[PDB]
Amino acid sequence: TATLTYPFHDWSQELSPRYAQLRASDAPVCPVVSEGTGDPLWLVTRYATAVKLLEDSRFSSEAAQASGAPRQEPVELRAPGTRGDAIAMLREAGLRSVLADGLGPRAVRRHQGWINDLAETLMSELASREGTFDLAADFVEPLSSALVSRTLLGELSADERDLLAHCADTGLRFCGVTHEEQVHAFTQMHEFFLEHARRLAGTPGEHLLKLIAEAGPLSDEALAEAGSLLVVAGFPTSSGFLCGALLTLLRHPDAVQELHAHPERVPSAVEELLRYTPLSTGSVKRMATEDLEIDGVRIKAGEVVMVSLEAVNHDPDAFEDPDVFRPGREGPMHFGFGRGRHFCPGNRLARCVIEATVRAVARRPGLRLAVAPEEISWHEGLFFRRPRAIPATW
């Protein structure tokens, strides 16, 4: 119909041209319809409007997560007949800040050493390789697997890691699998944690699931909900983003040569990667809890307004030459971690692993993509973009 269906099927790093067109339209908020549900939605693509949306106390993230809310995802991101309200259930137990606490600056100071050791071990192994090697399978996968075990869930076996990763990939999708396969992915996840979360939380370590369990005691359902939250929020984001960041670096050898010569510039390159490299193929979303206007557009209570972080991060009103990867950039704050109350509580740990990845690349001149960027294959339909492989050579 004449109402755009959402999302825009831009599964590779090439952002859908529709975002820029909506950004330059006369409307600061554009009505769309969810392809997966037919629900009406509003879409924001301008930085200035997105700031207003994500800092407005009348827009509720949790209300947009509730069952029956208009939504972009085809299947609800909860197990059948469960609350799907992990952050609120943690706060109910009196754990208001455990996620930020276990992922903040002190946690980076605990984990940054081994994270950098491992990035270096993995890249040193690749430096010994002949011919073409795969940066997704042989760098991103082992690094993100270690991140998950050591910081989020506890020591997982290869089979457990494989199962949770498959559940995330299958459930967090707009298309490419059946409805039944999507629901089953969340089931295997929830039933996995109902059985194993107590065991995982009880093993020695600093992992977040232990911190949650060991801080009326927490029920197995709340602890299982916490496990599924950590998988959904932590696994496909880290693997998708690290893959995409590697692609960005390989496509910008001049920038990498600068980082090789001036390693103190790496933190700024991390921030530019967070702005430039696209991640989600949908939008962050909030529900209006009362009638309001945003930039003149009237929104009724109950309606859901979305912001594409990719669109905002590429807004020329905010970032001059927004489609240029410019590590020296000194523009406004990027939206890669969101904005306001729900700003990514994993942001410091994520920055730590991105930095370690950038340094591992910058230290080794000659690394290059083995084929043209347009020949990279992409997992079609994931919420969190990820290439199937990153073939590279020296």
Ligand code: HEM
């Ligand atoms: C490069 C990696 C990552 C990126 C780009 C990223 C990005 C984001 C963004 C944009 C949001 C805001 C969503 C919204 O406003 O609705 C968010 C929220 C969140 N992130 Fe991250 N994230 C990353 C890694 C992680 C990791 C490793 C964890 C560990 C569990 C994590 C945990 C969370 C949680 C729990 C939330 C929900 C906060 C809330 O809704 O209040 N993230 N993330």
Ligand SMILES: CC(C)[C@@H]1NC(=O)[C@H](Cc2c[nH]c3ccccc23)NC1=O
């Ligand atoms: C299920 C939780 C993640 C929960 N559900 C949400 O919709 C929001 C936003 C969010 C952050 N990271 C995600 C990854 C996949 C899908 C959604 C999200 N925050 C939550 O804590």
Ligand SMILES: CC(C)[C@@H]1NC(=O)[C@H](Cc2c[nH]c3ccccc23)NC1=O
């Ligand atoms: C149904 C999907 C759109 C799903 N629903 C969400 O609420 C989050 C929001 C989000 C946008 N960018 C991100 C980056 C990292 C973590 C979360 C997000 N993303 C999704 O893909």
